[PDB]
């Protein structure tokens, strides 16, 4: 996260680390369930070197604050059984960037570990709302990583202004969220986190998934995010959730 603060311990418990074996963290996740987690697809791909999509090669830690300490009171470590990815995922567009993960062991809820609600099909997020970004990643583009859990506010912007800021590259799976001006905005290792918004009576729902975007913070490129409701029923479906 660019152009955000620390965030405070237990501030965001939904958000999980996503650590492939022997490479510490690579993504971000959100609890959604006592056995699922949401992420992105675009983790799980395998390279030459790596089996991303093998599920035995990674491990989540629920309830993480900061990546040094992770044996901290609290801290849950958990191995994934699955990766769902979406059948739709196109890795050249990006298009249908999600994934659904279950846990080996289901995460025990805590004042640290707690699910984040999911928005219903029908629900927009209106243009302008107010949201928040958290994860690990960098903190500056080609900088590096955050040991400290980081947040950002960033907010809802316009489908057509999305689509003319990156021409040829935004589907109707994608939201763009941040600011014209820059400043504030998701970044390497952030990917596969959630959108937290706060709703009607102060709950929090997740808005979306961190997917890409070019570069970080620069002016009139804002970070690109999957929508959550047009998935509510794939996730249904998929987890029982
Ligand atoms: N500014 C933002 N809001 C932002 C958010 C998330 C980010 O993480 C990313 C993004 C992308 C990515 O797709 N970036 C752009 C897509 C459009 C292309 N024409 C140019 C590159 C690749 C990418 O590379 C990876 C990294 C890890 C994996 C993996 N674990 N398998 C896969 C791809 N990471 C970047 C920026």
Redesign the pocket.
Known sequence: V?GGTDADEGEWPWQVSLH?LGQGH??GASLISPNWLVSAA????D?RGFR?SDPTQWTAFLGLHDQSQRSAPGVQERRLKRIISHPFFNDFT?DYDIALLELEKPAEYSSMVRPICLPDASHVFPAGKAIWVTGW?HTQ?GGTGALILQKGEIRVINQTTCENL?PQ?ITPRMMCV?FLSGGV???????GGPLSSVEADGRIFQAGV????????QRN?????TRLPLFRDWIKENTGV
């Open positions: 660019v492939a690579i993504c675009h983790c799980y791909i390279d991303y990006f990643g583009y990156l590259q941040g905005d998701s970044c390497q290792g952030d990917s961190v997917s890409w975007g070019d570069g970080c913070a490129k804002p970070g690109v995010y």
